[PDB]
Ligand binder design. Sequence first.
Ligand code: HEM
Ligand SMILES: O[C@@](Cn1cnnn1)(c1ccc(F)cc1F)C(F)(F)c1ccc(-c2ccc(OC(F)(F)F)cc2)cn1
Length: 528
Amino acid sequence: IVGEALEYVNIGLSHFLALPLAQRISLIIIIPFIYNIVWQLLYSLRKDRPPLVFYWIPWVGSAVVYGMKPYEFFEECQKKYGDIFSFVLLGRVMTVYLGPKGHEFVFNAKLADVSAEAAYAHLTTPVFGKGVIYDCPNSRLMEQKKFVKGALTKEAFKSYVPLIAEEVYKYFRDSKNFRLNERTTGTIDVMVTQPEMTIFTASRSLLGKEMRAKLDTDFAYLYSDLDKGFTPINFVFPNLPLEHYRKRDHAQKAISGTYMSLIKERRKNNDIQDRDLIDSLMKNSTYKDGVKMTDQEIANLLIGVLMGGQHTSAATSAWILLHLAERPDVQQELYEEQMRVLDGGKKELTYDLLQEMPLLNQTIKETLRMHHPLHSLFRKVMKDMHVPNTSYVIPAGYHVLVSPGYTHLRDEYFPNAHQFNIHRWNNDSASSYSVGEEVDYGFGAISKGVSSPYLPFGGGRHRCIGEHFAYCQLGVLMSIFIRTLKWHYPEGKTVPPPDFTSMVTLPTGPAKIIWEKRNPEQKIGGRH
Ligand code: HEM
Ligand SMILES: O[C@@](Cn1cnnn1)(c1ccc(F)cc1F)C(F)(F)c1ccc(-c2ccc(OC(F)(F)F)cc2)cn1
């Protein structure tokens, strides 16, 4: 008789349901925690799965450790388990593939194996709007990137350079952080100054003078609100009945409206030229199946590209200034190059002259190596993936995580990886370099191999299309900083650690530098 025993199963369940509320609430915690521990131990005998990082708290997983310092988490995991390992993150299973073969396994994954929009849609769509980037099929994204890249040409960069330089000189003249006509030395926070310079220069060149002029009004409040909405909290809390979210949503509606007003006002007056990205998106924003982007999708794609280039470029800027601020030898070297290429300052900065400043371009290159703005890129795995040369299978529903920024800081690929050395790039000062065969996913010919250990702009179909614009912008910025100012740290200060819980790996604030004018009596002309 085990019928007697199955009777006691029923009896035992009734006694459980009659336990005090003190013991049942403690059991609604103990039973998940123990089953979590038993499951992991049985999962560790699966030979068709990467090793899984142990963790106590269910659902949360390695969240805290990974979120606070992810490169140190990866290196500990890499020493324990090798280059392929999985870890649980706020409900998901993330399979990291570290190193250049992980660049290949993720960035070059078949379109049917992995989805970037499935990983990112809740991150970006609430900020940018609907129908663009990750709120549309991949084929739509590929052509959207063709549209934007069609405004990012050599000829456009030759007109952006004097526009960007004008904004920098105006910032030095008019901003309270400088006032170079009035002050010859001062202290700035680079996390204050660089996001401002970045949007001022990005607005003026990409969006035009009307949109730039709007940031001198109360309208700048809306960019701030929108900017605050650009956060990784959206991964788990995209829309909450909270106040930050309404200012964010209001700002998205208000900013896309301004852009549409200009779009419809320029099409009504047929004022459609070749000035800015707006004119280009107006002239060239029809998919190859003949559907035209709407005015609203055009404005949402403007917010996406402006927001993305905003955070990457302003963090990089801030990092270039923070590193140079303890390197007066590099400032000095960079300044000699300015004097040589620009005839002691008697030549006007041009896009062409920027391409003859290899040390300045190497400084950007070296900063992006040490401070890759994106420490982790995700795809959601759609179909079961076999990891080559292993017995590993990554089942559907997993995420794959690739981290070229980790590889940038490994000694085995960059000698003395943790030293800032622009001369590691002597005779290799180009933003990036397709080391062979190319391929086109819809937005131009890019590198087919993505095995490079330096991948600041990723690779494959989801590869950045902003790299030439960002060099142009940073190039002009830094060329004017160098020529105008020396700068250094307050006493006993140094490079800050990155913020990895943020949207980009920007420096922990406040990060102050002291500036002094090279020519205290030089004045900046124009009215204010
Ligand atoms: C220092 C500056 C920048 C860096 C290091 C950078 C880095 C990256 C990386 C790593 C990716 C790949 C993301 C992924 O694989 O999930 C990417 C994609 C992209 N970036 Fe950038 N970015 C920068 C600035 C910009 C700028 C200035 C623009 C446009 C003006 C831009 C537009 C884009 C676009 C459209 C994509 C495509 C994403 C996709 O296809 O899913 N970025 N960028
Ligand atoms: O790729 C971006 C940024 N980007 C690139 N180029 N310019 N901007 C982008 C792409 C196309 C655009 F049109 C605009 C745009 F902005 C992005 F999609 F948003 C993006 C994707 C992922 C993350 C990320 C942040 C934190 C993370 O870490 C932890 F721990 F999870 F929080 C992990 C991942 C940040 N940004």
